[PDB]
Amino acid sequence: EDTEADVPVTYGEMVLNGANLVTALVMGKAVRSLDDVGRHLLDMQEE
Amino acid sequence: HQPLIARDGPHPVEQPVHNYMTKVIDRRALNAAFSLATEAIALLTGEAL
Amino acid sequence: DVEFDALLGSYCNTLSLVRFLELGLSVACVCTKFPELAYMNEGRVQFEV
Amino acid sequence: TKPLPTAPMAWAESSPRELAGHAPLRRVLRPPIARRDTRATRDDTEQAVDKILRGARRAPRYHLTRQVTLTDLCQPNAERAGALLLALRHPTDLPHLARHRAPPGRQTERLAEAWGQLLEASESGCARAGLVSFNFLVAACTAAYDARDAAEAVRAHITTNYAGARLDRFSECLRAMVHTHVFPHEVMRFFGGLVSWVTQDELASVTAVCSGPQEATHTGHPGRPCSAVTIPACAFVDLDAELCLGGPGAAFLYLVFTYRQCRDQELCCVYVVKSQLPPRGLEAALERLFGRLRITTCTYAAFAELGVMPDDSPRCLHRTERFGAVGVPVVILEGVVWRPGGWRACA
What we know:
- Chain B: It comes from Human herpesvirus 2.
- This is part of a larger assembly, with 3 copies of chain A and 1 copy of chain D.
- By secondary structure, chain A is mainly alpha-helical.
- Chain A has 2 helices and 1 strand; from the N terminus they run αβα.
- The longest helix of chain A is centred in the C-terminal third of the chain and has 13 residues, at 34-46.
- In chain D, a hairpin with a 4-residue loop joins β10 (316-322) and β11.
- Classes of the chains: A mainly alpha, D alpha+beta.
- The interface between A and C is small, with 9 and 8 residues.
């Protein structure tokens, strides 16, 4: 046995905000962190 | 994405292999119920006081 | 009405790169880069004892 | 953003007697008689408790019946947002009764073999099989009743979603039932409108409306991420629309079983009639329009009243919905109120 205790944690939350809503209506599709996933694709071709 | 080994002799010849795959989320719903007697209602609203 | 479909994550993989000078097996041999072997027929080693 | 004609919107954009009620009564003291002289999860928990607040701050146009059955017959998923579910009661009488109420010259053993055979084709334990869908009757009698391939298009729907065996076995049961004076009615009463199924494996928990209006249910575009809502007759083959001649009145919706007694060998006809006549007038118009009286007893049809469509106009006929690959004349009925009614056929 090692420690009878340990250092766990709480909850992680996903929400549709800003340009997720706007793609969940007029489209009906959503992607986790479309903000960064979206702007890493825009950065990517701006060099 | 998977690795290779370059190898000699009468062997076929390696090519990198990339496997792409999606999975789907398994939807359930957990549910529980409680309940109020008919007396409790109307006592709590303030109806019978 | 609202309904939608979501992509709940992407997960990629990192190819490890094994060097072979970072290994155990590198002990049991001597390595030299000889760029002209393409151009050589017989290579030899003398060994007097 | 505010009108010119203000009095019409304060009522539109939106009691004091109950306030005045407690005022004289409750405010008054010692009466009567007289003496002279935790971002999202936390938010969710709080809201559920609160919801219990408002719903417990107050307190009828809706009724839900809920039941668990198998998917052998019926099947909620194949069906949709607006659908007729008919109950089926007591499989125990595999023609036990066939013994009685069956006239002589009748091999009352037909049902027991037809029906027991149905079971072999498709035991008692965790659940029982109730809930026949409207659909599943249209296909079973499709080749039986009068229009074919508008009718068979419904049959293609069920074989590809809900088995032709069960349809054929169940059709053999309908033939055997209409044979021996145990009818499809005196079985199969109306159950509801199919709000939400919640199925598992071979099991289904079907919520459906005992009575009240349909359109006001889970609503949305569709109930859950499925499609819209409607009480679509499912047949351009069913939806016999009476009132060939008519004046505005609330249309009415009935459920009729028409039979063949050796004219066609125990025909089963099942469809819906939509016209403004109060059941005491439907028996008359059912006497007409029908030559199925073949004695060849005299009990040709049996009808119960499903409810009202308190607007004449929504009677859309659409051979346009997909319940899988198959396409069916589908007639859409816009707005319906369910009055379960009772089964009346004496003759």
